[PDB]
Write a protein that binds this ligand. Structure first.
Ligand code: GDP
Ligand code: GDP
Ligand code: GDP
Lengths: 433, 238, 410, 433
């Protein structure tokens, strides 16, 4: 089956992937603390999309196709304490110093040091794959490692392989408050890579992921244990078509997902949404039907993004149903109303790539995942382009980017290369209007 | 009911068996190739070259899908397609496919292999037909050195390349070098009697020496060679 | 026509777990011994339903039958058809033949005699062992003496397992063959020599799974059954055990047979089963081929194999084969059929081939004996347990004669 | 089943056997501090090879067939504090004075006093056995008790019984430093017995057992708690064929082991090796396959001996696999390379007695044990023969051997009888070359 590697860069990408392989292993009926399945019985679903057979005894551990890369040791040592013998600890690479909001440490620095060791483990995974057809890099677009080495690694991987999708499932900076002081820098330095050398960059935003766990999962303080579960359940939702060969499962590979969702090579920043956002308190009589999950998919406060999705133009949309469906013609006819309700872009007549997966989610029985390639995703990056310029008219922080090896000529290119990105939806908004 | 139709039925079953085997166990690609070569041969004999080509392309696709790439296998498959093109009379394509085989081997370890020396010989022969003498000579010399290092100087394959160079030099009227080549071939071929070499190859060497000596103005040694070839061809009636 | 079976040694009893789980399948019985074809051959009819097999599970190191009579097959075998005694014929011929052999041989024979006085048409002995160890080859050499001394007019077929040419698997193992291959040559009317190197390879091409000695023995356990399935599943060209001595054993020494099985419910169209049966790589021994011409091949094709095909298939095969100069043009290959395939298969094949190549097995086991005996290299374990060097060099001088008797048969 | 007694002489033999019956009882699922099994359920494997049924209630203690003999009280009182009601305390014989590096106290002295009491307990064990087919005497060849009484007991046991193997699993003096000042004496006095009246003497060396726990079990200071576990896991490895009646277990008795490993009556000093020497820290993805354990069996620093094994001639070899094997033809074909790599002795065409045991080890899943009867084992004893002569040209210590009852004529015999031993491999090296 189409194998797929989940590379986990940075603290924000690892702590998603700490919770992502918790989910995926529990999704395949595999113990997430040992790597071994239930004794003697096969794992449910098609395990070999993400996993690898370690030991031919049918009860041994299944090592996930996952390299966890971060320049700070405390993140993966948290994972090594909370995974046991699940991961391959040759893939759980760590360093000492860290990056610390400095792009030019993850990209050209301590991340340059790990790059001969990281790529010597992707080559270990890919040669171990049957035929790998996607690489899901989990990082943030805010830090020094996830946005630094994530910009390095993806440009070190399509440059090497190139015939493989790189879905950079990434976490944008929240606009409510910046978790890094150099966070509108580090995005624009990664928007060089995540525009040019990544086939798609699935965004997530920490503001919207707070609101979708506070107002929707009805808790007071949504921790990062639950931000990395809203993301996870979406990342374990877009990859349910990759991992399951069921009844009428529309088996969507990453390339099969991105041919439907990347219209032209500079329009591949995808948002996401999940349904139902019913809390896990067993609201059984309030479980949502398919006619009303799609009504809750496309709310303005339902996507995992700072922008307002229905205030702009949905350019390419991919609604990935996942679970027990009784109603195929009631499916796709709710989207027929949503073809009328939602702002679409003629420039495209119709775009709803609809996945079914009969294997249900862990938390949900009838779960829906959206991937709307929106034009509003430039309006998230309009904030980042503006917060860059306020920190470039002053020529902000200091030498911190410049002493590591970057130049003022290069930084103005990458601002333009993010300006070329933001205009590339502004090209596609009014022409799509 | 015809003998050829019988050979085809048998070869087809045997191929279908190897196909099913490779369905149950995708790794068994080498054996599929072998069975295919026999059926492809028969399709060539009946003139269905597109069927033969399809068989080898199928072999190739299976080889290409291996999780552990086997360049040696691919090299061999390309050389079977090359030979198919050669017998079909598609001379440019035969050269192109031998060249593809060589490129796969050059990129992996296989520069000094059995297959590679064979390919270089066969490719050199196509270059002779393309009237590219210098390229033909180059490849023949490489095939010659490799067979020298792999087999002794005293081997059928070394003598065959000597022979092929001989004919190449003779055809471009380099009579001196033709002579050296065919004599070196003669020297080896005499010392190798059993089923490791049939006597008809020995007769070809005398035949070729005959034309070389005649071109050299030694009509005496020429007739002596032509005589010994006639003696050999006669002596294989018993 | 009711064949007694003896399973001596760990190698033989592990075949008995494979053989009596295949003899129950081909006769269509459950594992307990009751009814789920001539069932009288292998099985003694005790009651109306239950069929106790005619097997002695003679063994030292009594943990092999503890696997057999512990798990799923304790109800099948009769426990007055067994022997279990410690110590374990310590991979030492002189323990198995003399020390711990003479302790059990009065019990072995009086259990055989209590199993053949229930017969009513005794014909043969499918005595299953190895020539490698100390129990299968030591006590296997002792039973062959005492059984021929008791039944000199009954065919004793030895189903040996030769030491591997690949490595040893036992240190003193080339001693234990020649001490046994003597007594097989002296007593048994025809032996089937099998080889764990070929049993590894042919099972490796059979299964998509790395074999074990349960999976290896199912090649043997079919060959043990296919030899004696024209005797119990009659069909046409009824080949009994008396015709594997008259047809396949030309000279009074050349009775070491190399048996293949094919196909390796599995159907086979059968112009290719005869090419699979007489494949050189499907014969279950590392016999010689580039310096080897056959003497007398056999072909027992069982199941849905109709006899018209062998006029086109087997006459084509025998042209492809290499016989001795003193065998005729289309002759030299006996045939047979059964009207019932083994369970799991739909058309099987067997080929007992008497061949000069089995002397290369003998020549290996003498060339190993040549260095190892003259330098006393494990000899004192025989000397200090009954068997002298006079008794052991005399074992060589028959096998060196026997390795010459195939070279005289070319 | 073939019963087998483990007699434990000396402090060095007892502290192995303190840890040996810890292992074997845990190997059979028996509590090593009470002797009783888990309540109601049978012990795993075939218990009766080493044990005895004490109390017919199926939950009572299983007394091991083991007599622990030492002339110092503190060693067995350590065992009595760390075994509970496991051993039969009529077999746990102790005295007061000790021997103290004096061969002629364990042999002719305080060990002569215990010999009517020790042999009155072997006779208790052997009569209790079904049919005993081996006696594994655990001692050292360095001290006054293990090398003294071990030389006495084995010559008092084959003299009495004689139809039984005596595998003296013994610990040679380390050549790096001598733990006894009279240690090259006491070996040569025991090399009378361990050559003449023992059917085999399995050696162990404290230098190699330090290196195989420091470099291989990756600890800093290997204590004697871990020397007696490298030995133990090997002694619980050569006896896994004796104690287990499993799937395809090649049930190798001691006589069945020594017929394959003692070529002629003066060549029965056997080395040993263990694989994998993976540390117990759960190196699960670094667990070794069968093609590479055998590559780690035959390293020069892999045997439990001071000598370099591949620098001399392997005369008789017995590779005892023990554990879950998937690969029988990949087994024995690694040894086919090792038939070519290793220095063997024509003088023997082939010698690899290969045990399989499906019951896995405690510490390891796929464990391998070697027993190579090497010609280098005279080169260990060449050191001991040389260190004897430097302490006999001076006529070293004093009257200490001579006042107890030994003579200068006798001591020169036993040096020659050890010279007859060392030449007996020197006979078998160049003739085996
Ligand atoms: N979804 C999610 N986002 C996080 C988490 N931890 C950190 N982030 C975000 O990730 C961004 C950058 O942090 P990071 O890349 O881990 O810094 P680095 O390790 O120095 O590269 C910050 O803006 C945080 O808001 C987490 O556990 N989950
Ligand atoms: N075909 C086959 N060979 C075996 C089996 N078990 C062991 N062998 C081989 O038989 C040979 C002899 O061992 P064996 O006769 O069982 O020892 P013994 O019973 O103590 O005499 C060894 O060299 C093994 O390789 C088995 O189950 N099947
Ligand atoms: N493997 C191992 N060797 C030991 C241990 N204790 C002592 N030795 C060795 O045993 C040798 C002799 O000690 P020992 O026989 O116990 O002295 P005795 O009690 O006076 O006879 C010394 O050279 C030590 O190196 C132990 O616990 N394990």
């Amino acid at each position: 089956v189409n194998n797929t590697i989940v590379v986990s860069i940075g603290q924000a990408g690892n702590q998603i992937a700490a919770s992502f392989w918790k989910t995926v292993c529990l999704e395949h009926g595999i113990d997430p603390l040992t790597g071994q399945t239930a004794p003697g019985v096969a794992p449910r679903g098609n395990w070999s999309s993400f996993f690898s057979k370690l030991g031919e005894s049918s009860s041994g551990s299944y090592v996930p196709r996952a390299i966890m890369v971060d320049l700070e040791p405390s993140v993966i040592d948290n994972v090594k304490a909370t995974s046991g013998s699940l991961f391959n600890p040759a893939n759980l690479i760590s360093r000492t110093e860290g990056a610390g909001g400095n792009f030019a440490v993850g990209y050209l620095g301590a991340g340059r040091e790990v790059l001969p060791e990281v790529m010597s483990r992707l080559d270990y995974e890919i040669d171990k794959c049957d035929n790998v057809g996607g690489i899901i890099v989990l990082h943030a677009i805010g830090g020094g490692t996830g946005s630094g080495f994530g910009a390095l690694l993806i440009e070190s991987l399509k440059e090497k392989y190139g015939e493989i999708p790189v879905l950079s499932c990434a976490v944008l900076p929240s606009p409510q408050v910046s978790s890094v002081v150099t966070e509108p820098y580090n995005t624009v330095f990664a928007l060089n890579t995540l525009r040019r050398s990544a086939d798609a960059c699935l965004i997530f935003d920490n503001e919207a992921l707070f609101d979708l766990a506070h107002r929707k999962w009805n808790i007071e303080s949504p921790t990062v244990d639950d931000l990395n579960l809203l993301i996870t359940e979406a990342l374990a939702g877009i990859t349910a078509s990759m991992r399951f060969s069921g009844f009428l499962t529309v088996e969507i590979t990453l390339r099969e997902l991105l041919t439907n969702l990347v219209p032209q090579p500079s329009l591949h920043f995808l948002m996401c949404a999940f349904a139902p956002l019913t809390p896990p308190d067993r609201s059984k009589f309030e479980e949502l039907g398919i006619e009303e999950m799609i009504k809750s998919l496309f709310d303005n406060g339902s996507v995992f993004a700072a922008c307002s999705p229905m205030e702009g133009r949905f350019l390419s949309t991919a609604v990935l149903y996942r679970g027990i469906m009784e109603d195929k013609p009631l499916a796709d006819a709710a989207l027929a109303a949503m073809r009328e309700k939602l702002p679409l872009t003629y420039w495209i007549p119709t775009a709803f790539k609809i996945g079914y997966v009969e294997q249900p989610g862990i938390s949900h029985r009838k779960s829906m995942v959206l991937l709307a390639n929106n034009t509003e995703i430039a309006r998230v990056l309009d904030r980042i382009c503006h917060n860059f310029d306020k920190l470039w008219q002053r020529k902000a922080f200091a030498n911190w980017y410049l002493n590591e090896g970057m130049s003022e000529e290069q930084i103005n290119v990458l601002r333009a290369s993010a300006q070329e990105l933001v205009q590339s939806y502004q090209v596609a908004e009014e022409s799509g209007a | 009911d015809t003998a050829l139709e019988r050979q085809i039925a048998s070869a087809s079953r045997s191929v279908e068996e190897a196909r099913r085997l490779a369905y149950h166990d995708p790794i068994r690609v080498g054996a599929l190739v072998e069975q295919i070569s026999v059926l492809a041969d028969l399709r060539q004999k009946e003139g269905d070259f597109r069927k033969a080509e399809s068989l080898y392309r199928e072999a190739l696709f299976r080889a290409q899908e291996l999780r552990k790439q086997d360049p040696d296998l691919l090299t061999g498959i390309y050389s079977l397609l090359a030979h198919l093109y050669d017998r079909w009379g598609r001379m440019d394509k035969a050269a192109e496919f031998y060249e593809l085989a060589l490129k796969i081997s050059a990129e992996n370890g296989l520069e000094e292999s059995d297959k590679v020396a064979t390919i270089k010989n066969n490719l050199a022969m196509i270059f002779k037909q393309l009237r590219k003498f210098e390229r033909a000579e180059g490849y023949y010399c490489e095939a010659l050195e490799t067979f020298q290092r792999l087999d002794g100087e005293q081997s059928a394959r070394v003598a065959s390349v000597y022979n092929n160079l001989g004919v190449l030099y003779y055809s471009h009227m380099d009579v001196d070098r033709a002579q050296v080549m065919h004599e070196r071939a003669l020297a080896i071929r005499q010392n190798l009697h059993e089923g490791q070499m049939d006597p008809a190859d020995l007769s070809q060497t005398f035949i070729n020496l005959g034309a070389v000596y005649k071109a050299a103005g030694d009509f005496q040694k020429a007739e002596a060679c032509v005589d010994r070839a006639k003696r050999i061809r006669a002596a294989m009636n018993g | 026509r009711e064949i007694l079976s003896i399973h001596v040694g760990q190698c033989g009893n592990q075949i008995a777990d494979s053989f009596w789980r295949l003899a129950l399948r081909e006769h269509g019985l459950t594992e307990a011994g009751t009814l789920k074809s001539n069932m009288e051959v292998f099985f003694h009819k005790v009651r109306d339903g239950k069929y106790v097999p005619r097997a002695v599970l003679v063994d030292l190191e009594p943990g092999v039958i503890a696997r057999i009579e512990g798990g799923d097959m304790s109800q099948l075998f009769d426990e007055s058809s067994i022997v279990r005694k410690i110590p374990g014929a310590a991979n030492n011929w002189a323990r198995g033949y003399n020390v711990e052999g003479e302790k059990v041989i009065d019990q072995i024979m009086n259990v055989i005699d209590s199993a053949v006085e229930k017969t009513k048409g005794l014909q043969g002995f499918l005595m299953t062992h190895s020539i490698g160890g100390g129990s299968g080859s030591g006590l296997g050499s002792l039973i062959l003496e005492r059984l021929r001394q008791a039944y000199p007019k009954k065919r004793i077929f030895t189903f040996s397992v030769v030491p591997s040419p690949l490595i040893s698997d036992s240190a003193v193992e080339p001693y234990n063959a020649i001490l046994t291959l003597q007594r097989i040559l002296d007593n048994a009317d025809g032996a089937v020599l099998l080889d764990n190197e070929a049993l590894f390879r042919i099972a490796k091409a059979k299964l998509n799974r790395s074999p074990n000695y349960m999976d290896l023995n199912n090649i043997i356990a079919l060959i043990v059954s296919s030899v004696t399935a024209s005797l119990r599943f009659p069909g046409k060209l009824n080949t009994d055990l008396s015709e594997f001595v008259t047809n396949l054993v030309p000279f009074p020494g050349n009775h070491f047979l190399t048996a293949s099985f094919a196909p390796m419910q599995v159907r086979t169209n059968f112009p290719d089963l005869a090419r699979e049966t007489f494949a050189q790589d499907n014969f279950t021994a590392a016999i010689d081929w580039q310096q080897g011409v056959y003497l007398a091949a056999s072909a027992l094709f069982r199941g849905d194999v109709k006899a018209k095909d062998v006029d086109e298939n087997m006459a084509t095969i025998r042209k492809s084969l290499n016989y001795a100069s003193y065998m005729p043009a289309s002759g030299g290959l006996k045939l047979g059929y059964a009207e019932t395939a083994p369970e799991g298969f739909a058309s099987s094949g067997l080929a007992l081939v008497n061949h000069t190549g089995i002397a290369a097995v003998f020549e290996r086991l003498i060339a190993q004996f040549d260095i190892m005996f003259d330098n006393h290299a494990y000899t004192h374990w025989y000397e200090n347990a009954g068997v002298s060097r006079d008794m052991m060099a005399k074992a060589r001088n028959q096998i060196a004669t026997l390795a010459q008797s195939y070279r005289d048969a070319s």
